[PDB]
Scaffold this active site. Sequence first.
Site, short mmCIF file in Angstrom:
data_model
loop_
_atom_site.label_atom_id
_atom_site.label_comp_id
_atom_site.label_asym_id
_atom_site.label_seq_id
_atom_site.Cartn_x
_atom_site.Cartn_y
_atom_site.Cartn_z
N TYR A 45 -21.03 11.61 -11.93
CA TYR A 45 -20.78 12.27 -13.20
C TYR A 45 -19.41 12.95 -13.20
O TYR A 45 -18.80 13.19 -12.16
CB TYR A 45 -21.90 13.27 -13.52
CG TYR A 45 -21.72 14.61 -12.86
CD1 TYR A 45 -20.93 15.59 -13.44
CD2 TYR A 45 -22.27 14.85 -11.62
CE1 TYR A 45 -20.74 16.82 -12.83
CE2 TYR A 45 -22.07 16.06 -10.98
CZ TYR A 45 -21.31 17.04 -11.59
OH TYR A 45 -21.17 18.21 -10.91
N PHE A 55 -13.22 21.62 -15.89
CA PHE A 55 -13.59 20.24 -15.65
C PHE A 55 -14.33 20.16 -14.32
O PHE A 55 -13.96 20.84 -13.37
CB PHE A 55 -12.33 19.36 -15.63
CG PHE A 55 -12.61 17.87 -15.73
CD1 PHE A 55 -12.99 17.13 -14.62
CD2 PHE A 55 -12.50 17.21 -16.95
CE1 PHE A 55 -13.25 15.76 -14.72
CE2 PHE A 55 -12.77 15.85 -17.04
CZ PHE A 55 -13.15 15.12 -15.93
N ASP A 56 -15.32 19.27 -14.23
CA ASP A 56 -16.05 19.04 -13.00
C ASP A 56 -16.23 17.56 -12.74
O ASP A 56 -16.68 16.81 -13.60
CB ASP A 56 -17.47 19.60 -13.08
CG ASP A 56 -18.33 19.32 -11.86
OD1 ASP A 56 -17.75 19.19 -10.76
OD2 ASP A 56 -19.58 19.25 -12.03
N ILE A 75 -29.87 21.82 -15.63
CA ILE A 75 -29.99 22.22 -17.02
C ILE A 75 -30.83 21.21 -17.79
O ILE A 75 -30.86 20.01 -17.46
CB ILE A 75 -28.59 22.39 -17.64
CG1 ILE A 75 -27.75 21.12 -17.44
CG2 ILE A 75 -27.91 23.64 -17.09
CD1 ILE A 75 -26.63 20.98 -18.42
N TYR A 101 -26.27 26.59 -20.61
CA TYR A 101 -26.17 27.89 -19.94
C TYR A 101 -26.36 29.03 -20.94
O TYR A 101 -26.28 30.20 -20.57
CB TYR A 101 -24.83 27.98 -19.19
CG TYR A 101 -24.74 27.00 -18.05
CD1 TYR A 101 -25.26 27.30 -16.80
CD2 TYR A 101 -24.23 25.73 -18.24
CE1 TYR A 101 -25.24 26.38 -15.76
CE2 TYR A 101 -24.20 24.80 -17.22
CZ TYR A 101 -24.71 25.12 -15.97
OH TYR A 101 -24.68 24.16 -14.97
N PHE A 118 -20.50 15.52 -20.78
CA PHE A 118 -20.63 14.87 -19.50
C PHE A 118 -20.57 13.37 -19.67
O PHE A 118 -21.11 12.81 -20.62
CB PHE A 118 -21.98 15.15 -18.83
CG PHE A 118 -22.14 16.54 -18.28
CD1 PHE A 118 -21.69 16.86 -17.00
CD2 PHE A 118 -22.69 17.55 -19.07
CE1 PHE A 118 -21.82 18.16 -16.51
CE2 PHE A 118 -22.83 18.84 -18.57
CZ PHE A 118 -22.39 19.14 -17.29
C1 LIG Z 1 -32.99 24.51 -14.58
O1 LIG Z 1 -31.81 25.25 -14.86
C2 LIG Z 1 -30.82 25.23 -13.95
C3 LIG Z 1 -30.78 24.46 -12.77
C4 LIG Z 1 -29.69 24.56 -11.91
C5 LIG Z 1 -28.64 25.47 -12.23
C6 LIG Z 1 -27.50 25.59 -11.42
C7 LIG Z 1 -26.40 24.79 -12.15
C8 LIG Z 1 -26.71 23.25 -12.10
O2 LIG Z 1 -25.73 22.54 -12.98
C9 LIG Z 1 -26.15 21.58 -13.85
O3 LIG Z 1 -27.32 21.54 -14.21
C10 LIG Z 1 -25.17 20.68 -14.44
C11 LIG Z 1 -25.64 19.18 -14.58
C12 LIG Z 1 -25.58 18.58 -13.21
C13 LIG Z 1 -24.22 18.58 -12.71
C14 LIG Z 1 -23.83 19.94 -12.45
N1 LIG Z 1 -23.89 20.71 -13.71
C15 LIG Z 1 -22.88 21.45 -14.20
O4 LIG Z 1 -22.95 22.05 -15.27
C16 LIG Z 1 -21.57 21.48 -13.40
C17 LIG Z 1 -21.65 22.34 -12.29
C18 LIG Z 1 -21.92 23.71 -12.49
C19 LIG Z 1 -21.94 24.57 -11.39
O5 LIG Z 1 -22.19 25.91 -11.48
C20 LIG Z 1 -22.73 26.31 -12.73
C21 LIG Z 1 -21.70 24.04 -10.11
O6 LIG Z 1 -21.73 24.95 -9.09
C22 LIG Z 1 -22.20 24.55 -7.81
C23 LIG Z 1 -21.43 22.67 -9.91
O7 LIG Z 1 -21.20 22.21 -8.65
C24 LIG Z 1 -20.81 20.83 -8.49
C25 LIG Z 1 -21.40 21.84 -11.01
C26 LIG Z 1 -20.34 21.95 -14.27
C27 LIG Z 1 -19.39 22.85 -13.93
C28 LIG Z 1 -18.46 23.02 -14.88
C29 LIG Z 1 -18.69 22.25 -15.95
CL1 LIG Z 1 -17.69 22.17 -17.41
S1 LIG Z 1 -20.01 21.38 -15.74
C30 LIG Z 1 -26.59 22.59 -10.83
C31 LIG Z 1 -25.37 22.61 -10.14
C32 LIG Z 1 -25.23 21.89 -8.95
C33 LIG Z 1 -26.26 21.12 -8.42
C34 LIG Z 1 -27.48 21.07 -9.11
O8 LIG Z 1 -28.55 20.32 -8.65
C35 LIG Z 1 -28.45 19.48 -7.48
C36 LIG Z 1 -28.31 20.32 -6.20
O9 LIG Z 1 -28.63 21.56 -6.24
O10 LIG Z 1 -27.84 19.69 -5.21
C37 LIG Z 1 -27.62 21.79 -10.31
C38 LIG Z 1 -28.71 26.22 -13.40
C39 LIG Z 1 -29.78 26.08 -14.28
O11 LIG Z 1 -29.93 26.77 -15.45
C40 LIG Z 1 -28.73 27.32 -15.98
#
Ligand SMILES: COc1ccc(CC[C@@H](OC(=O)[C@@H]2CCCCN2C(=O)[C@H](c2cc(OC)c(OC)c(OC)c2)c2ccc(Cl)s2)c2cccc(OCC(=O)O)c2)cc1OC
Length: 128
Positions: A45, A55-56, A75, A101, A118
């Site tokens: 992704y 950006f990620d 999320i 968020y 995304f």
């Molecule tokens: C159920 O609700 C949630 C679950 C998890 C979280 C944390 C943020 C949660 O982030 C996400 O859900 C989304 C979709 C999946 C890709 C990552 N996501 C992000 O939003 C991205 C993200 C966000 C991050 O911090 C918020 C992050 O920090 C570690 C990250 O690392 C790679 C990536 C983005 C950063 C900046 C952007 Cl503009 S988008 C998260 C981040 C990293 C890994 C992960 O799962 C796999 C693992 O743990 O290996 C889950 C917040 C939640 O609520 C806010």
Amino acid sequence: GAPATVTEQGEDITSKKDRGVLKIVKRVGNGEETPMIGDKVYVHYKGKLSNGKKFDSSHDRNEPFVFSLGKGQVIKAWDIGVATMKKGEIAHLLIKPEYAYGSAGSLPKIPSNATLFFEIELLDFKGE
Ligand SMILES: COc1ccc(CC[C@@H](OC(=O)[C@@H]2CCCCN2C(=O)[C@H](c2cc(OC)c(OC)c(OC)c2)c2ccc(Cl)s2)c2cccc(OCC(=O)O)c2)cc1OC
């Protein structure tokens, strides 16, 4: 831009049908099957704030991003969105803050009330 297309032509895949997660298929995946809740999922992704220079791409053809679908590991927008994808599918999602968020955001990474964009590739999925 890519967000723009999703707005205009994306399908609203929420239940409440509140346009909180809009999806476009950019590449069609293989066969018909898509993941069940509790399937381990493997994706590439990248993402960005819609109006932001955050950006990620950590998982951008580098290592796969792996999680278990509908366990709240991500999320809501991803539990919703990735569930709809075929193996080999690439798709755009546009995501209202309520399915991300919310007003809390995730400082300093994500601000309060962020819309997110995304591009997701579903590489594979396996039964838990
Ligand atoms: C159920 O609700 C949630 C679950 C998890 C979280 C944390 C943020 C949660 O982030 C996400 O859900 C989304 C979709 C999946 C890709 C990552 N996501 C992000 O939003 C991205 C993200 C966000 C991050 O911090 C918020 C992050 O920090 C570690 C990250 O690392 C790679 C990536 C983005 C950063 C900046 C952007 Cl503009 S988008 C998260 C981040 C990293 C890994 C992960 O799962 C796999 C693992 O743990 O290996 C889950 C917040 C939640 O609520 C806010």
